[PDB]
């Protein structure tokens, strides 16, 4: 059965079904609450190369959605746009009533191609994609989300800045996936799994100020050296 949390004396206990306690008091349905908590609060990796490896494609399982009434401010949020090599779309369109996560600091927008097996993209660890007050089990196309879980509670008787970071991934869904951070329609930077979003913004600023942007009609991909960490090579 679904556990129910009881808060008393500023302490949280799991309700016991067989043992009937009389101390706890319920007065109205206003006390019952559902809260969604982000996975990043548990100290897990949040960058795109490590985050995108927790999602896998499957077929033969219908999706399910359950609502929640309160959430937590998310520092990292994701937005996916994946297409098959022939040109078809992988992720389904967002149904009516589904909206992106309301409070996101950095929105990682990833667009690319992959084999796209199966039909729906599930979470390998069994978590939920939170969305806007509607936690689902699959990923929808073009809608911002955030990994997290849901808990049910009995409550006791008693500014906003959004920044979008754009990526480009090749081989999405496989073990050999190549990621590229985008600073311009022609200039890219090779992406490693140790760059915080602020570091990527600083790299963009350095690219723009130092005049390393592509001047020809082709593509230019920079590679940052590991030791000095400030002199981009190629």
């Amino acid at each position, epitope marked *: 059965s679904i556990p129910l949390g009881v808060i008393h004396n500023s302490t949280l206990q799991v309700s016991d079904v067989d043992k009937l306690v009389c101390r706890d008091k319920l007065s109205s349905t206003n006390q019952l609450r559902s809260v969604g908590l982000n996975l990043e609060g548990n100290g897990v990796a949040t960058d795109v190369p490590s985050a995108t490896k927790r999602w896998g494609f499957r077929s033969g399982v219908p999706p399910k959605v359950v609502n929640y009434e309160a959430g937590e401010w998310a520092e990292n949020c994701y937005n996916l746009e994946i297409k098959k090599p022939d040109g078809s779309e992988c992720l389904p369109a967002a149904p009516d009533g589904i909206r992106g996560f309301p409070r996101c600091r950095y929105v990682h927008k990833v667009s690319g191609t992959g084999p796209c097996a199966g039909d729906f993209a599930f979470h390998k660890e069994g978590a939920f994609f939170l969305y806007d007050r509607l936690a689902s089990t699959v990923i929808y196309r073009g809608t911002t989300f955030a990994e997290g879980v849901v808990a049910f509670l009995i409550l006791p008787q008693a500014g906003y800045y959004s920044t979008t970071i754009r990526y480009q991934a090749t081989g999405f869904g496989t073990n050999e996936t190549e990621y590229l951070f985008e600073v311009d329609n022609l200039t890219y930077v090779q992406l490693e799994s140790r760059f915080t979003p602020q570091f990527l913004l600083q790299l963009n600023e350095t690219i723009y100020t130092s005049g390393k942007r592509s001047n020809t*009609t082709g593509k230019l991909i920079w590679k940052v050296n590991p030791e000095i960490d400030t002199t981009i090579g190629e």
Partner: antibody
Amino acid sequence: QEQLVESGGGLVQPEGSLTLTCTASGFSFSSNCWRCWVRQAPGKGLEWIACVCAGRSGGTTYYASWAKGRFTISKTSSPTVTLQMTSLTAADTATYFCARAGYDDYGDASFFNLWGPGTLVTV
Amino acid sequence: VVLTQTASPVSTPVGGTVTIKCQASQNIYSNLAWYQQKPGQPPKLLIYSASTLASGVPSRFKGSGSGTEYTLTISDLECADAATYYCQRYYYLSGSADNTFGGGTEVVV
């Protein structure tokens, strides 16, 4: 700026062999690494032959169904890429182009944005 | 996949719009590229993704269409705009590298 000059081509007897060389200059070879060959018979439409990911380790070589075994593209570390033809039948007389693939927001695709002048092959 | 173009020596007086249609045998999810080839010179890319203008291309050309039918429209016609036009379907290099060209439609000024 960017040039894709090609070398080779001319008059060769049937059931022969010939090698074409594509030289590239003026752009980042490691970044734009896909190079393809396109054939156009005199007065007819274009036709894809083969592609190669020259400029970085790994990659893949993609061939066409009609041109299998008779043609072979070579992975040269230098920007120059060679295409070797064998058993040149009388229908192979055409103009050959060395082209560089383009890219879109979702990655590199098969459409070509830079072309070479084209070399003649007569059998 | 087979692509059917207008397939006619289209003639249009200077200043008028000329439209070319490139029908396909199935849905291609807007994966068409429009090329212009003058006699003797190698082809030049004009349109990719059926809507995006290539770099250094005048805004006179426009592309539209989706599904199995796509169109290329030249709003203003000049003397230089007299060459053969092609439409190709392309794949992404992550998977296959198949590329299928059209037939070719010449334009008479």
